[PDB]
Amino acid sequence: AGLMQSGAVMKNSGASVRVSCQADGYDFIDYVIHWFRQRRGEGLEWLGWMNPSGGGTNYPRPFQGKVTMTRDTSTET
Amino acid sequence: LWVTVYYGVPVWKDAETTLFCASDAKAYETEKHNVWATHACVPTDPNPQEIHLENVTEEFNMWKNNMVEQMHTDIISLWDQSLKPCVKLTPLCVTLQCTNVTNNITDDMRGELKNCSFNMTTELRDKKQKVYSLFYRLDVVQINSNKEYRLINCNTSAITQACPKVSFEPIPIHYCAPAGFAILKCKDKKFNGTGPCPSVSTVQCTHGIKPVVSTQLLLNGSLAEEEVMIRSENITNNAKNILVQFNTPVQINCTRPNNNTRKSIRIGPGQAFYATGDIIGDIRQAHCNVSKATWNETLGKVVKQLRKHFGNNTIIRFANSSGGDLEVTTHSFNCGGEFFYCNTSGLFNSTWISNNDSITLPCRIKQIINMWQRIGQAMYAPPIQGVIRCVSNITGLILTRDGGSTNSTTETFRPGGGDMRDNWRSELYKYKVVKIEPLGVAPTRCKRR
Amino acid sequence: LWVTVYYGVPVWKDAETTLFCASDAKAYETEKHNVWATHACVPTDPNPQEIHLENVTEEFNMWKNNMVEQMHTDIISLWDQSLKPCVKLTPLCVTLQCTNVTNNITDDMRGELKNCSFNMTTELRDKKQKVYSLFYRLDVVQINSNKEYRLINCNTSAITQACPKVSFEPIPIHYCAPAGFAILKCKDKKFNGTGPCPSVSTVQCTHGIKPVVSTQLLLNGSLAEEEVMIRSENITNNAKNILVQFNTPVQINCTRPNNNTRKSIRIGPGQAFYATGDIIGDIRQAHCNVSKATWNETLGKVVKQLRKHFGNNTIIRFANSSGGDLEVTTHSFNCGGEFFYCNTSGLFNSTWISNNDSITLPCRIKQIINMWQRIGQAMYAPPIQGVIRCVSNITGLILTRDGGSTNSTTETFRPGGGDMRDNWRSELYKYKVVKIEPLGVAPTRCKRR
Amino acid sequence: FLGAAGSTMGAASMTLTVQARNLLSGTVWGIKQLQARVLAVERYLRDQQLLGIWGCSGKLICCTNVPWNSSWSNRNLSEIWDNMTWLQWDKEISNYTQIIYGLLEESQNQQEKNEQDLLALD
Amino acid sequence: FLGAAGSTMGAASMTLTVQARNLLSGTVWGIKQLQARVLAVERYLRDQQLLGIWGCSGKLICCTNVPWNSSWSNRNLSEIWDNMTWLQWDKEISNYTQIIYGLLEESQNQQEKNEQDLLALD
Amino acid sequence: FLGAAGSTMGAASMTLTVQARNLLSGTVWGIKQLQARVLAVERYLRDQQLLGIWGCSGKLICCTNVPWNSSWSNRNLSEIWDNMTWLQWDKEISNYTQIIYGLLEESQNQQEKNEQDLLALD
Ligand SMILES: *[C@@H]1O[C@H](CO)[C@@H](O[C@@H]2O[C@H](CO)[C@@H](O[C@@H]3O[C@H](CO[C@H]4O[C@H](CO)[C@@H](O)[C@H](O[C@H]5O[C@H](CO)[C@@H](O)[C@H](O)[C@@H]5O[C@H]5O[C@H](CO)[C@@H](O)[C@H](O)[C@@H]5O)[C@@H]4O)[C@@H](O)[C@H](O[C@H]4O[C@H](CO)[C@@H](O)[C@H](O)[C@@H]4O)[C@@H]3O)[C@H](O)[C@H]2NC(C)=O)[C@H](O)[C@H]1NC(C)=O
Ligand SMILES: *[C@@H]1O[C@H](CO)[C@@H](O[C@@H]2O[C@H](CO)[C@@H](O[C@@H]3O[C@H](CO[C@H]4O[C@H](CO)[C@@H](O)[C@H](O[C@H]5O[C@H](CO)[C@@H](O)[C@H](O)[C@@H]5O[C@H]5O[C@H](CO)[C@@H](O)[C@H](O)[C@@H]5O)[C@@H]4O)[C@@H](O)[C@H](O[C@H]4O[C@H](CO)[C@@H](O)[C@H](O)[C@@H]4O)[C@@H]3O)[C@H](O)[C@H]2NC(C)=O)[C@H](O)[C@H]1NC(C)=O
Ligand SMILES: *[C@@H]1O[C@H](CO)[C@@H](O[C@@H]2O[C@H](CO)[C@@H](O[C@@H]3O[C@H](CO)[C@@H](O)[C@H](O)[C@@H]3O)[C@H](O)[C@H]2NC(C)=O)[C@H](O)[C@H]1NC(C)=O
Ligand SMILES: *[C@@H]1O[C@H](CO)[C@@H](O[C@@H]2O[C@H](CO)[C@@H](O[C@@H]3O[C@H](CO)[C@@H](O)[C@H](O)[C@@H]3O)[C@H](O)[C@H]2NC(C)=O)[C@H](O)[C@H]1NC(C)=O
Ligand SMILES: *[C@@H]1O[C@H](CO)[C@@H](O[C@@H]2O[C@H](CO)[C@@H](O[C@@H]3O[C@H](CO)[C@@H](O)[C@H](O)[C@@H]3O)[C@H](O)[C@H]2NC(C)=O)[C@H](O)[C@H]1NC(C)=O
Ligand SMILES: *[C@@H]1O[C@H](CO)[C@@H](O[C@@H]2O[C@H](CO)[C@@H](O[C@@H]3O[C@H](CO)[C@@H](O)[C@H](O)[C@@H]3O)[C@H](O)[C@H]2NC(C)=O)[C@H](O)[C@H]1NC(C)=O
Ligand SMILES: *[C@@H]1O[C@H](CO)[C@@H](O[C@@H]2O[C@H](CO)[C@@H](O[C@@H]3O[C@H](CO)[C@@H](O)[C@H](O)[C@@H]3O)[C@H](O)[C@H]2NC(C)=O)[C@H](O)[C@H]1NC(C)=O
Ligand SMILES: *[C@@H]1O[C@H](CO)[C@@H](O[C@@H]2O[C@H](CO)[C@@H](O[C@@H]3O[C@H](CO)[C@@H](O)[C@H](O)[C@@H]3O)[C@H](O)[C@H]2NC(C)=O)[C@H](O)[C@H]1NC(C)=O
Ligand SMILES: *[C@@H]1O[C@H](CO)[C@@H](O[C@@H]2O[C@H](CO)[C@@H](O)[C@H](O)[C@H]2NC(C)=O)[C@H](O)[C@H]1NC(C)=O
Ligand SMILES: *[C@@H]1O[C@H](CO)[C@@H](O[C@@H]2O[C@H](CO)[C@@H](O)[C@H](O)[C@H]2NC(C)=O)[C@H](O)[C@H]1NC(C)=O
Ligand SMILES: *[C@@H]1O[C@H](CO)[C@@H](O[C@@H]2O[C@H](CO)[C@@H](O)[C@H](O)[C@H]2NC(C)=O)[C@H](O)[C@H]1NC(C)=O
Ligand SMILES: *[C@@H]1O[C@H](CO)[C@@H](O[C@@H]2O[C@H](CO)[C@@H](O)[C@H](O)[C@H]2NC(C)=O)[C@H](O)[C@H]1NC(C)=O
Ligand SMILES: *[C@@H]1O[C@H](CO)[C@@H](O[C@@H]2O[C@H](CO)[C@@H](O)[C@H](O)[C@H]2NC(C)=O)[C@H](O)[C@H]1NC(C)=O
Ligand SMILES: *[C@@H]1O[C@H](CO)[C@@H](O[C@@H]2O[C@H](CO)[C@@H](O)[C@H](O)[C@H]2NC(C)=O)[C@H](O)[C@H]1NC(C)=O
Numbered sequence A: 001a002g003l004m005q006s007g008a009v010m011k012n013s014g015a016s017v018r019v020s021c022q023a024d025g026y027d028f029i030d031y032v033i034h035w036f037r038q039r040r041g042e043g044l045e046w047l048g049w050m051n052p053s054g055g056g057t058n059y060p061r062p063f064q065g066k067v068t069m070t071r072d073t074s075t076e077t
Numbered sequence B, C: 001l002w003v004t005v006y007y008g009v010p011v012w013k014d015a016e017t018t019l020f021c022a023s024d025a026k027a028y029e030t031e032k033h034n035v036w037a038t039h040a041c042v043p044t045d046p047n048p049q050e051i052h053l054e055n056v057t058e059e060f061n062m063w064k065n066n067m068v069e070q071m072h073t074d075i076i077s078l079w080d081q082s083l084k085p086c087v088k089l090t091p092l093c094v095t096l097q098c099t100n101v102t103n104n105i106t107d108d109m110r111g112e113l114k115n116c117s118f119n120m121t122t123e124l125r126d127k128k129q130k131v132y133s134l135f136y137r138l139d140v141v142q143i144n145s146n147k148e149y150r151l152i153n154c155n156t157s158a159i160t161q162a163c164p165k166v167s168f169e170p171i172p173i174h175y176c177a178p179a180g181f182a183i184l185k186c187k188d189k190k191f192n193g194t195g196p197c198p199s200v201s202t203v204q205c206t207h208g209i210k211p212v213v214s215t216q217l218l219l220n221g222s223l224a225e226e227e228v229m230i231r232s233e234n235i236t237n238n239a240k241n242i243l244v245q246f247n248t249p250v251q252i253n254c255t256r257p258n259n260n261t262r263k264s265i266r267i268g269p270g271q272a273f274y275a276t277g278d279i280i281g282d283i284r285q286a287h288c289n290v291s292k293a294t295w296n297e298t299l300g301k302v303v304k305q306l307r308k309h310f311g312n313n314t315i316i317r318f319a320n321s322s323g324g325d326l327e328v329t330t331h332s333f334n335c336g337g338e339f340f341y342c343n344t345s346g347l348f349n350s351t352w353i354s355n356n357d358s359i360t361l362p363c364r365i366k367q368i369i370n371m372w373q374r375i376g377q378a379m380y381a382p383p384i385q386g387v388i389r390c391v392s393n394i395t396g397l398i399l400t401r402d403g404g405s406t407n408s409t410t411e412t413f414r415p416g417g418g419d420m421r422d423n424w425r426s427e428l429y430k431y432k433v434v435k436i437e438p439l440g441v442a443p444t445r446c447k448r449r
Numbered sequence D, E, F: 001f002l003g004a005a006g007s008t009m010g011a012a013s014m015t016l017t018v019q020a021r022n023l024l025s026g027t028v029w030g031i032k033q034l035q036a037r038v039l040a041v042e043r044y045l046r047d048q049q050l051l052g053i054w055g056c057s058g059k060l061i062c063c064t065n066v067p068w069n070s071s072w073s074n075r076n077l078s079e080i081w082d083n084m085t086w087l088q089w090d091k092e093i094s095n096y097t098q099i100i101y102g103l104l105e106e107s108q109n110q111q112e113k114n115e116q117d118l119l120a121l122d
């Protein structure tokens, strides 16, 4: 089962990008998602979470507006 | 010492059973066929039948509870029911030559509503039916030409039209248990949802409860009493939504302020459609008004009632939502049949320290829901002619704590929600189901023949 | 002598009641919503609860039995259930511009599969939808032009598409009775289905049983033990099909050996179709392999186990079927969702007297069933990408005796079947339902006050 | 549980305690086992009723103020508790159960409790 | 009704009469309260059965021909009717209820009613 | 069966044995007679419960340690078993049934079985 992270990718200063977590093996709607980051030799960091139900989230203070995490219930993604 | 048993003893334990409603009598008479959905719901014990309990304390857990999920499965069951025989809508996923508006109603109501035109099944099978109707912007979607749109649902989920005879009025329901099962009823006013509650009664026919349908804002609910109350399964867990109950009723007046007109379209036989017609006179957006200073003082007593957990001096701040579906990002709810989504943005741009008109926030109306993520079926909210006005009390709120990783520096909140079950927990906080066993045996120097 | 009654006495008689399943616990956890169909089936007594019986003999009749037909009505009931909410297919009885194949796959797989192309409802109502899909030869039919075909069902019976979330895996089910009713359990290994059985236990929760679905060949079933067993209601009646149970498991490996691809066609809203795409790489026919010499020796021990009825020296011969529908003329069955029909012709062209690779017989796949003659509805067997492989044990067989009117000259057999109920009798052979009455009165010189 | 119905009646008499133990032991397709449990309860209660309307009701065993009938298969005392079994008896008894019941339920307690009233007064 | 489970056992003993009063007190979504009432009846009857198979059956209170066991929490006479409550007892008792039942339902009436037969004859 | 409710009470007293005989006597549209049989059982059991919680339980007839009340329609001994019928009585009695029940179910066995305990000890 598990989850599908898209492959690594390069972009550019400024700019913007989108990343995919595909879910297989259970209830997309139940349960909740979080995201995390490890920089160049760094203690891991929390990014944010989404309940895939209504869609409610919570972005930590220093990353609000920076990040935009979402879901698609039908694609279960 | 011998043994001797006793039938009727005071002993029970943690169990959860099936339970039944109770909808009293004066609801029973209103002629016009069927009501809410309580078809065979049996009326209420007209006397308060409760028994105070002496020197007993046991532990309520408002999240480990069950009758909340009982009522949840119940209401999605009767949701399915309600519409099950109602009119289908399969000939609406059709192309839609549309446009905007023609009346002096400001950009405040610019377009948004749409004047679509399209063919349709007649009563018969052969003839088509060139027709036209008016729709809120969120019911339609572009497709790559003049103005042909699609309904939002037609790539996801079929849709049925509610029988117009249904009315969306929450009615006080008395959930009542069977015997062998009792409801322990907590009777202090300071019970943060978890733990043992000393002040208790025993009850079977819980009070009349309206299953109010709203996000972020909790409507017509129960009061708290002295010191407004707040509850979390473990608030340090920010992700645990926070549910709050007021000791103070918040006045709220909502209004969809346009005089509509209805179209009994004939997609017959039998199945008749109900469309929007053109509107009477001016056009203005639905919205709601609330008493400014009462709002002020309630959020006062709140922010007073929180720093206890977060240090008598901490930085508080509120904000508009973290971005969700229209149900969670706004105050979604129903009034008088149709469905509002209120931009609750205006009531949180604030920061709180330590110890004049009235507020008009606007709401936009939508007619296409598939609620409880129950997609596969959508409900067409039929139109209502005339205008709509709505008196309501606000009694609680669903909120989200920001996780500002510091120590106890700055903590900020927003109206949470999404999971509807809390609007039930918020009146289920005060009940526990117990299975009694009337048997209990004791040793004693007593002989038989 | 007076009279005196007794409550709990050991007396019962021939009765048949309603009974309930039992599906144990480790089946209960696999997350993903619903299983087989056991939604409320209650788990199994985790201990073998049985009682051997002393000096009791009474008569089992495996054909006069009932719980077989109980399970039969049960399974067609849940068959109806299973698909009841699943996706309809009414826009498929449509003309079908088709053709054959384009890949180096021999005449062994020549055409047979078809590459049809046709219009379709969109998500919306207006637009058509030019599309194309691939089908087994037996799903389609000519009509008097290039290559326009029809689905087989469209002149007989509508069709629904199974919800893909369903899986066709037989799971051991424990049929369990109520009280007052007992199951007498025969415990010799030599019980030709009829007559009294001395070696018996009493039981309520019968063993876990998989309702394997196959014709001629009996799969994953129960073993016999020492001397393979055979049963007929009266075999002299040739028309009485003969059911045989093995003491020996027959290895069988089936394979549909092509890597498919699936199409979530959008005939929306909601209702999404699932079509065949083009195939990965080479194409080869489904088939099955079986260990030659084990087959040899099992049919040995059989032909040894039959002439007892037909003289220690009689002419035996087997053959391919007497011509029936594809279900009975071949080894019909399911593996991994999709549905095989195996040309069991190859395993019977033999003649038996008195006292090396491995066998590869091919099977062709069909997706359109209406099984149990339950026409009026058909099931679309949806596709599966990748390849399919299937380990199975063969444990019994359904056969037909030729009526060669002589005296006991030559008698010849073929794989019978058709009536599915035998695959149940073949594990129902060992049970009888008895209604106990706990009451029994006797004369005796005892007085009351 | 129903241990040895083939053991004779006098042997079997030792315990009548487990056959009366598991005899209760604590959506369509879901309607059915409800329909089954309910008549299991009715059978139990039909029993307890036929029981209480007899002087019995006192569970399991109960002596009675009516004797035997010759014709009802004249036999012997050791021929049945030592040489017979339960169904073995009731298959024979099938031919007379009805008026047996009829006479118990009438000619007993009705007389017996009325006579009792005639002494439950003084 | 369940008035004061926190009152001690000797106080609570005064009436055992209302907890046994309202314990019965006289379409889908309509199937459910049927499914509930039915097992309320079964629980009542499981009770009455466990009761009658004991020498009890005589409602509410019933003395019995088996005494105590030391190890089963040796305590005192005034420490429980004057200082304890009901669940307070049965939470302790949870650890031994089973063989208690087992010995009642067997070693009692079965012996007791057979001995009774041994005198209900002469 | 309900033979002659118009025969007087003393005549009717002779048999109370058949009205208690057929009183149990052994898909939608199929759900209904289930819903009916079930409350027939509940009515029977409500009866047997109201019965057992009285000193009665002993079926059919049962003398009791509470007498009469003057005001409850003072009448005579021959005026009712020889000149009245059953409903004829209970239509009058409709006005007092409740506290009748209330006093039986309390002031009787509760006192009576506790006093019995007070002698079931020595
Ligand atoms: C939620 O909150 C929002 C925001 O506050 C509310 O929106 C308000 O909505 C109301 C009605 O929906 C609007 O009322 C209209 O006001 C206009 C303008 O009136 C002004 O100018 C005149 C002179 O030009 C003044 O005399 C007016 O003074 C009014 O108020 C004072 C008190 O402040 C009062 O003493 C005056 O007499 C006068 O009131 C009325 O007096 C007599 C009777 O007493 C009456 O005959 C007269 O018509 C006055 O209305 C004011 O400063 C006014 O022209 C409108 O009336 C006309 O047009 C409409 C449309 O055709 C007709 O229906 C009507 O009969 C008149 O012909 C309205 O009265 C208001 O402007 C608006 N905004 C604000 C800031 O209040 C929502 O209503 C709230 N909703 C809910 C559910 O809570
Ligand atoms: C049911 O029963 C039927 C009938 O028996 C089975 O059908 C068989 O199916 C298999 C696979 O599905 C077929 O296998 C293929 O064989 C070909 C031809 O191989 C021959 O020629 C070469 C030289 O040209 C010989 O060296 C081969 O010898 C093989 O077998 C011997 C033992 O007999 C072994 O010692 C050899 O090493 C060799 O085996 C393999 O060796 C190495 C690893 O050990 C491996 O790298 C090599 O590729 C050999 O396969 C033999 O005489 C062969 O070319 C095929 O391989 C290639 O093509 C496929 C297709 O692209 C690729 O997937 C694969 O990787 C290779 O590139 C296959 O191996 C077999 O011919 C066929 N028929 C018979 C009679 O066996 C079913 O499979 C059975 N199914 C079930 C469910 O039971
Ligand atoms: C929404 O759009 C519909 C289009 O289907 C509008 O209906 C049509 O509106 C036009 C004007 O916009 C009408 O035209 C005029 O009609 C009158 C009377 O027939 C005639 O005297 C004029 O010469 C001109 O042709 C048209 O009749 C009307 N048709 C129908 C069936 O309603 C509708 O007015 C729009 N509504 C809003 C609120 O924008
Ligand atoms: C919370 O309680 C208030 C108080 O009743 C509710 O206000 C009520 O709103 C409904 C419509 O949503 C009104 O119903 C309609 O009333 C009019 C006239 O009364 C009648 O013409 C209609 O046929 C319909 O019955 C209702 O009257 C009104 N209450 C009162 C006292 O007038 C409010 O709806 C409740 N909250 C929510 C979310 O519904
Ligand atoms: C929550 O509050 C924040 C800020 O308090 C709102 O942020 C704002 O987001 C909107 C939409 O993303 C931005 O709007 C843009 O404005 C231009 C010019 O008016 C308009 O032409 C564009 O079409 C676009 O809508 C806006 O710049 C941005 N910042 C501010 C200060 O408004 C956010 O919309 C609020 N969200 C909710 C759900 O309440
Ligand atoms: C089954 O039949 C369908 C027909 O609907 C085949 O799809 C079509 O197959 C043809 C070739 O047989 C494709 O033509 C070529 O397309 C490519 C890419 O567009 C182009 O470069 C060539 O010039 C030529 O036009 C056609 O595109 C293709 N269309 C679709 C929508 O698939 C399908 O290949 C057949 N499959 C098998 C296994 O036979
Ligand atoms: C008779 O019993 C055998 C033994 O289990 C059955 O073989 C089984 O076949 C099924 C498919 O029909 C396999 O299920 C699938 O398994 C794979 C990997 O195990 C998994 O990826 C799939 O999601 C699915 O669960 C099953 O694994 C396989 N048994 C074993 C032990 O691997 C056979 O199906 C039975 N007979 C019949 C007629 O079904
Ligand atoms: C059972 O076995 C018999 C014989 O053992 C099979 O009989 C044969 O039937 C087929 C079809 O009726 C005949 O086939 C013809 O063959 C020609 C040339 O190969 C072909 O071009 C025709 O299209 C036709 O199919 C065949 O002559 C006939 N005899 C033999 C010896 O094969 C029968 O098919 C088997 N049936 C089953 C259900 O196993
Ligand atoms: C409603 O149906 C009419 C036909 O009665 C449509 O009018 C046709 O529109 C198509 C657009 O593709 C033109 O090609 C035809 O020439 C039109 N006239 C005809 C067929 O007489 C009209 O577009 C439809 N409106 C919808 C679907 O919204
Ligand atoms: C909304 O529009 C309708 C239709 O124009 C109004 O209905 C009329 O109302 C007036 C005044 O109440 C009556 O005299 C007419 O007889 C009504 N006619 C019809 C066909 O309904 C309605 O009144 C408007 N809304 C309000 C609040 O006045
Ligand atoms: C919400 O509506 C109620 C009723 O329409 C308003 O209450 C009235 O308030 C006015 C003054 O604002 C008083 O003169 C009335 O006597 C009140 N009547 C009732 C029934 O309450 C309330 O003020 C409104 N609040 C807002 C924010 O619009
Ligand atoms: C799918 O629909 C197309 C039309 O979009 C069909 O193409 C037409 O086929 C008919 C055959 O009778 C011709 O007379 C027309 O000239 C064709 N072109 C058009 C209408 O533009 C096509 O045959 C359909 N394919 C099916 C039903 O398999
Ligand atoms: C059947 O075909 C599919 C599609 O080509 C194969 O799927 C790929 O498998 C390879 C190897 O396992 C992976 O590296 C790819 O990421 C897969 N892609 C997709 C889209 O599924 C599949 O593997 C083939 N069957 C087998 C048995 O290999
Ligand atoms: C059916 O499949 C099984 C398993 O794939 C085969 O059994 C294997 O047989 C080979 C030799 O034939 C052994 O080396 C393996 O150790 C066996 N493994 C298992 C798990 O059984 C069996 O031979 C196959 N039979 C046929 C007729 O194809």
Ligand SMILES: *[C@@H]1O[C@H](CO)[C@@H](O)[C@H](O)[C@H]1NC(C)=O
Pocket (backbone or CB within 6 Å): D069, D070, D071, D072
């Ligand atoms: C006993 O049965 C015989 C049958 O031979 C019958 O004549 C007799 O009347 C029966 N006894 C009584 C008391 O009825």
Ligand SMILES: *[C@@H]1O[C@H](CO)[C@@H](O)[C@H](O)[C@H]1NC(C)=O
Pocket (backbone or CB within 6 Å): D075, D076, D079
């Ligand atoms: C039965 O008992 C009688 C005496 O009452 C005796 O004569 C006869 O032999 C006995 N027979 C059997 C089979 O017990």
Ligand SMILES: *[C@@H]1O[C@H](CO)[C@@H](O)[C@H](O)[C@H]1NC(C)=O
Pocket (backbone or CB within 6 Å): E069, E070, E071, E072
């Ligand atoms: C009482 O419990 C003790 C446990 O210490 C056990 O040894 C003893 O056997 C029990 N009494 C009886 C009569 O079994």
Ligand SMILES: *[C@@H]1O[C@H](CO)[C@@H](O)[C@H](O)[C@H]1NC(C)=O
Pocket (backbone or CB within 6 Å): E075, E076, E079
């Ligand atoms: C219990 O009673 C014993 C005598 O049997 C006495 O020694 C002891 O102090 C008492 N303790 C309590 C707690 O009652």
Ligand SMILES: *[C@@H]1O[C@H](CO)[C@@H](O)[C@H](O)[C@H]1NC(C)=O
Pocket (backbone or CB within 6 Å): F069, F070, F071, F072
């Ligand atoms: C009998 O009824 C009378 C009514 O006149 C009442 O006064 C009296 O108290 C009743 N008897 C008892 C014992 O309560």
